[PDB]
Amino acid sequence: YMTNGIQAAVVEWIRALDLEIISLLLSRAWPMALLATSELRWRPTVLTDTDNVVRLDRRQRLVRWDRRPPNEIFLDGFVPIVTRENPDWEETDLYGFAKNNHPSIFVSTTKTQRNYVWTPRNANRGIVYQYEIYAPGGVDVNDSFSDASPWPNQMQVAFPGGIQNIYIRSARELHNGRIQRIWINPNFLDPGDLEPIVSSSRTPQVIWRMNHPDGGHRDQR
Numbered sequence: 001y002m003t004n005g006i007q008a009a010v011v012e013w014i015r016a017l018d019l020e021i022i023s024l025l026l027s028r029a030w031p032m033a034l035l036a037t038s039e040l041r042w043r044p045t046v047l048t049d050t051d052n053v054v055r056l057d058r059r060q061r062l063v064r065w066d067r068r069p070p071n072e073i074f075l076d077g078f079v080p081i082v083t084r085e086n087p088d089w090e091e092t093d094l095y096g097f098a099k100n101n102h103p104s105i106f107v108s109t110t111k112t113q114r115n116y117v118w119t120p121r122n123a124n125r126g127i128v129y130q131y132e133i134y135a136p137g138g139v140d141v142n143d144s145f146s147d148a149s150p151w152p153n154q155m156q157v158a159f160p161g162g163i164q165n166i167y168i169r170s171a172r173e174l175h176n177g178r179i180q181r182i183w184i185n186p187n188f189l190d191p192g193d194l195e196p197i198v199s200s201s202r203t204p205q206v207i208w209r210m211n212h213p214d215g216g217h218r219d220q221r
Protein backbone atom coordinates (compact mmCIF):
# COMPACT_ATOMS: atom_id res chain seq x y z
CA TYR A 1 0.00 0.00 0.00
CA MET A 2 0.97 3.65 -0.54
CA THR A 3 1.07 6.09 2.40
CA ASN A 4 1.94 9.77 2.93
CA GLY A 5 3.48 8.77 6.29
CA ILE A 6 4.82 11.85 8.12
CA GLN A 7 3.92 14.53 5.53
CA ALA A 8 1.73 16.40 8.07
CA ALA A 9 4.53 16.71 10.69
CA VAL A 10 5.71 20.13 11.97
CA VAL A 11 8.99 18.87 13.51
CA GLU A 12 11.61 19.18 10.73
CA TRP A 13 13.87 16.22 11.66
CA ILE A 14 10.83 13.87 11.67
CA ARG A 15 9.72 15.43 8.33
CA ALA A 16 13.13 14.78 6.72
CA LEU A 17 13.51 11.12 7.84
CA ASP A 18 12.75 8.02 5.74
CA LEU A 19 9.57 6.00 6.39
CA GLU A 20 11.63 2.93 7.42
CA ILE A 21 13.50 4.91 10.13
CA ILE A 22 10.33 6.48 11.60
CA SER A 23 8.75 2.98 11.50
CA LEU A 24 11.81 1.66 13.40
CA LEU A 25 11.46 4.33 16.13
CA LEU A 26 7.72 3.56 16.51
CA SER A 27 8.04 -0.27 16.68
CA ARG A 28 11.52 -1.03 18.20
CA ALA A 29 10.36 -0.98 21.86
CA TRP A 30 7.34 -3.31 21.29
CA PRO A 31 7.49 -6.62 23.23
CA MET A 32 8.44 -9.73 21.21
CA ALA A 33 4.94 -11.17 21.79
CA LEU A 34 3.40 -7.98 20.34
CA LEU A 35 5.87 -7.94 17.40
CA ALA A 36 4.84 -11.53 16.53
CA THR A 37 1.13 -10.60 16.36
CA SER A 38 1.27 -6.94 15.24
CA GLU A 39 2.75 -4.85 12.41
CA LEU A 40 3.00 -1.04 12.14
CA ARG A 41 0.14 0.09 9.87
CA TRP A 42 0.22 3.65 8.49
CA ARG A 43 -3.00 5.21 7.18
CA PRO A 44 -3.02 4.40 3.44
CA THR A 45 -3.56 7.09 0.78
CA VAL A 46 -6.88 5.43 -0.11
CA LEU A 47 -8.85 4.10 2.90
CA THR A 48 -12.30 2.79 3.86
CA ASP A 49 -13.91 5.30 6.25
CA THR A 50 -16.26 4.69 9.23
CA ASP A 51 -19.38 4.87 6.96
CA ASN A 52 -17.81 2.31 4.53
CA VAL A 53 -17.14 5.09 1.96
CA VAL A 54 -13.76 4.91 0.20
CA ARG A 55 -11.96 8.25 0.72
CA LEU A 56 -8.56 9.87 0.31
CA ASP A 57 -6.58 10.17 3.59
CA ARG A 58 -6.90 13.99 3.49
CA ARG A 59 -10.74 13.72 3.25
CA GLN A 60 -11.16 11.53 6.37
CA ARG A 61 -12.56 13.88 9.05
CA LEU A 62 -10.30 13.55 12.10
CA VAL A 63 -10.72 15.56 15.31
CA ARG A 64 -8.50 16.52 18.25
CA TRP A 65 -9.84 17.56 21.66
CA ASP A 66 -7.45 20.17 23.11
CA ARG A 67 -7.54 22.72 25.96
CA ARG A 68 -5.28 25.19 24.09
CA PRO A 69 -7.08 27.99 22.16
CA PRO A 70 -6.94 28.97 18.41
CA ASN A 71 -4.42 31.82 18.99
CA GLU A 72 -1.80 29.08 19.62
CA ILE A 73 -3.16 26.13 17.59
CA PHE A 74 -4.06 27.94 14.32
CA LEU A 75 -0.71 29.79 14.56
CA ASP A 76 1.60 26.84 15.38
CA GLY A 77 -0.45 23.75 14.43
CA PHE A 78 -0.13 20.80 16.82
CA VAL A 79 3.48 20.59 18.03
CA PRO A 80 4.16 17.39 20.03
CA ILE A 81 5.44 17.49 23.63
CA VAL A 82 8.83 15.98 22.64
CA THR A 83 10.49 17.72 19.65
CA ARG A 84 14.24 17.16 20.31
CA GLU A 85 16.45 15.47 17.69
CA ASN A 86 17.72 12.74 20.07
CA PRO A 87 14.64 11.58 22.02
CA ASP A 88 14.61 8.61 24.41
CA TRP A 89 13.08 5.32 23.22
CA GLU A 90 10.15 5.90 25.64
CA GLU A 91 9.27 9.12 23.79
CA THR A 92 9.15 7.46 20.31
CA ASP A 93 7.25 4.26 21.25
CA LEU A 94 3.74 3.95 19.72
CA TYR A 95 2.53 1.19 22.09
CA GLY A 96 3.46 3.07 25.29
CA PHE A 97 1.92 6.25 23.82
CA ALA A 98 -1.27 4.39 22.87
CA LYS A 99 -1.44 2.64 26.28
CA ASN A 100 -0.28 5.25 28.84
CA ASN A 101 0.03 8.60 26.94
CA HIS A 102 3.37 9.72 28.43
CA PRO A 103 5.30 12.67 26.85
CA SER A 104 6.12 11.77 23.23
CA ILE A 105 6.67 12.80 19.59
CA PHE A 106 3.03 11.90 18.72
CA VAL A 107 -0.11 14.04 18.43
CA SER A 108 -3.34 12.12 19.10
CA THR A 109 -6.47 12.46 16.93
CA THR A 110 -9.65 10.37 16.55
CA LYS A 111 -11.76 9.37 13.52
CA THR A 112 -15.23 10.89 13.08
CA GLN A 113 -17.73 8.05 13.48
CA ARG A 114 -19.79 8.73 10.34
CA ASN A 115 -23.17 7.17 11.23
CA TYR A 116 -20.48 11.23 16.53
CA VAL A 117 -16.92 10.83 17.88
CA TRP A 118 -15.07 9.51 20.96
CA THR A 119 -15.32 12.06 23.79
CA PRO A 120 -12.72 12.34 26.61
CA ARG A 121 -13.52 12.06 30.34
CA ASN A 122 -13.78 15.79 31.18
CA ALA A 123 -14.87 17.20 27.78
CA ASN A 124 -17.99 18.74 29.40
CA ARG A 125 -15.99 20.67 32.08
CA GLY A 126 -14.04 23.91 31.54
CA ILE A 127 -13.02 25.42 28.19
CA VAL A 128 -12.33 22.71 25.55
CA TYR A 129 -11.77 22.87 21.77
CA GLN A 130 -12.65 20.14 19.25
CA TYR A 131 -10.33 20.86 16.31
CA GLU A 132 -11.34 19.51 12.87
CA ILE A 133 -8.36 17.97 11.03
CA TYR A 134 -7.95 17.02 7.35
CA ALA A 135 -4.35 15.76 7.12
CA PRO A 136 -2.27 13.32 5.02
CA GLY A 137 -0.56 10.22 6.48
CA GLY A 138 -0.50 9.30 10.18
CA VAL A 139 -0.40 5.95 11.99
CA ASP A 140 -3.59 3.89 12.38
CA VAL A 141 -3.42 2.57 15.96
CA ASN A 142 -6.25 -0.02 15.78
CA ASP A 143 -5.01 -1.49 12.48
CA SER A 144 -1.46 -1.63 13.93
CA PHE A 145 -2.23 -3.52 17.17
CA SER A 146 -5.60 -5.16 16.25
CA ASP A 147 -7.04 -6.86 19.42
CA ALA A 148 -3.90 -5.85 21.39
CA SER A 149 -4.87 -2.16 20.91
CA PRO A 150 -5.30 -0.87 24.51
CA TRP A 151 -8.18 1.59 23.89
CA PRO A 152 -9.97 0.57 20.62
CA ASN A 153 -12.99 2.89 21.14
CA GLN A 154 -10.66 5.91 20.72
CA MET A 155 -10.11 5.04 17.00
CA GLN A 156 -6.76 6.79 17.27
CA VAL A 157 -4.76 8.18 14.34
CA ALA A 158 -1.36 9.19 15.78
CA PHE A 159 0.87 11.73 13.99
CA PRO A 160 4.63 11.43 14.72
CA GLY A 161 6.15 14.94 14.59
CA GLY A 162 2.78 16.72 14.91
CA ILE A 163 0.24 18.25 12.52
CA GLN A 164 0.78 21.45 10.48
CA ASN A 165 -1.74 24.30 10.86
CA ILE A 166 -2.63 24.06 7.13
CA TYR A 167 -4.41 20.72 7.83
CA ILE A 168 -6.69 22.13 10.60
CA ARG A 169 -9.96 23.44 9.07
CA SER A 170 -11.98 24.52 12.12
CA ALA A 171 -12.43 24.43 15.91
CA ARG A 172 -15.57 24.09 18.09
CA GLU A 173 -15.16 26.20 21.27
CA LEU A 174 -17.03 24.51 24.16
CA HIS A 175 -17.54 26.10 27.61
CA ASN A 176 -18.70 23.37 30.05
CA GLY A 177 -19.99 21.15 27.22
CA ARG A 178 -21.88 23.98 25.44
CA ILE A 179 -20.66 25.31 22.06
CA GLN A 180 -19.89 29.05 21.93
CA ARG A 181 -18.19 29.55 18.53
CA ILE A 182 -16.96 27.74 15.42
CA TRP A 183 -13.50 29.03 14.45
CA ILE A 184 -12.51 29.08 10.76
CA ASN A 185 -8.78 28.69 9.99
CA PRO A 186 -7.85 31.12 7.17
CA ASN A 187 -4.60 29.22 6.39
CA PHE A 188 -6.37 25.83 5.91
CA LEU A 189 -5.16 24.23 2.66
CA ASP A 190 -8.52 23.11 1.25
CA PRO A 191 -8.26 19.80 -0.68
CA GLY A 192 -11.75 20.29 -2.22
CA ASP A 193 -14.92 18.15 -2.11
CA LEU A 194 -15.22 18.34 1.71
CA GLU A 195 -18.63 18.63 3.38
CA PRO A 196 -19.62 21.98 4.94
CA ILE A 197 -18.55 22.54 8.57
CA VAL A 198 -21.09 21.04 11.00
CA SER A 199 -23.08 23.95 12.44
CA SER A 200 -26.48 25.07 13.69
CA SER A 201 -27.62 28.63 12.89
CA ARG A 202 -27.32 29.76 16.54
CA THR A 203 -23.55 29.16 16.76
CA PRO A 204 -21.63 32.05 15.10
CA GLN A 205 -18.82 31.14 12.67
CA VAL A 206 -15.75 33.34 13.28
CA ILE A 207 -12.86 33.79 10.82
CA TRP A 208 -9.67 33.61 12.92
CA ARG A 209 -6.75 36.07 12.85
CA MET A 210 -3.51 36.30 14.87
CA ASN A 211 -4.21 37.55 18.43
CA HIS A 212 -8.01 37.50 17.93
CA PRO A 213 -9.57 39.07 21.09
CA ASP A 214 -12.03 36.16 21.61
CA GLY A 215 -9.41 33.62 20.38
CA GLY A 216 -7.48 32.93 23.62
CA HIS A 217 -10.13 31.62 26.05
CA ARG A 218 -8.75 28.83 28.27
CA ASP A 219 -8.62 27.22 31.72
CA GLN A 220 -6.41 28.62 34.49
CA ARG A 221 -3.09 26.77 34.89
Ligand SMILES: NC(=O)c1ccc[n+]([C@@H]2O[C@H](COP(=O)([O-])OP(=O)(O)OC[C@H]3O[C@@H](n4cnc5c(N)ncnc54)[C@H](O)[C@@H]3O)[C@@H](O)[C@H]2O)c1
Pocket residue numbers: 063064065066067068079080081097098100101108109110120154155156
Ligand atom coordinates in the same frame (compact mmCIF):
# COMPACT_ATOMS: atom_id res chain seq x y z
N1 LIG B 1 -6.61 14.63 21.94
C1 LIG B 1 -7.62 13.90 21.48
O1 LIG B 1 -8.62 14.41 20.94
C2 LIG B 1 -7.58 12.43 21.62
C3 LIG B 1 -7.90 11.60 20.54
C4 LIG B 1 -7.86 10.21 20.70
C5 LIG B 1 -7.49 9.67 21.93
N2 LIG B 1 -7.17 10.48 23.02
C6 LIG B 1 -6.79 9.89 24.31
O2 LIG B 1 -7.17 10.75 25.37
C7 LIG B 1 -6.19 10.66 26.43
C8 LIG B 1 -5.67 12.05 26.72
O3 LIG B 1 -4.71 12.40 25.68
P1 LIG B 1 -4.53 13.90 25.14
O4 LIG B 1 -4.33 13.82 23.66
O5 LIG B 1 -5.61 14.86 25.54
O6 LIG B 1 -3.19 14.19 26.01
P2 LIG B 1 -2.06 15.26 25.69
O7 LIG B 1 -0.87 15.17 26.57
O8 LIG B 1 -1.74 15.21 24.25
O9 LIG B 1 -2.61 16.72 26.01
C9 LIG B 1 -3.43 17.05 27.16
C10 LIG B 1 -3.22 18.54 27.27
O10 LIG B 1 -1.80 18.89 27.26
C11 LIG B 1 -1.62 20.18 26.69
N3 LIG B 1 -0.67 20.03 25.62
C12 LIG B 1 -0.71 19.12 24.61
N4 LIG B 1 0.31 19.22 23.75
C13 LIG B 1 1.04 20.28 24.27
C14 LIG B 1 2.24 20.88 23.83
N5 LIG B 1 2.92 20.50 22.75
N6 LIG B 1 2.73 21.92 24.57
C15 LIG B 1 2.02 22.30 25.68
N7 LIG B 1 0.90 21.79 26.15
C16 LIG B 1 0.46 20.78 25.41
C17 LIG B 1 -2.99 20.64 26.18
O11 LIG B 1 -3.55 21.51 27.17
C18 LIG B 1 -3.79 19.35 26.10
O12 LIG B 1 -5.22 19.53 26.27
C19 LIG B 1 -5.18 9.59 25.98
O13 LIG B 1 -5.67 8.30 26.39
C20 LIG B 1 -5.30 9.67 24.46
O14 LIG B 1 -4.91 8.45 23.81
C21 LIG B 1 -7.22 11.87 22.85
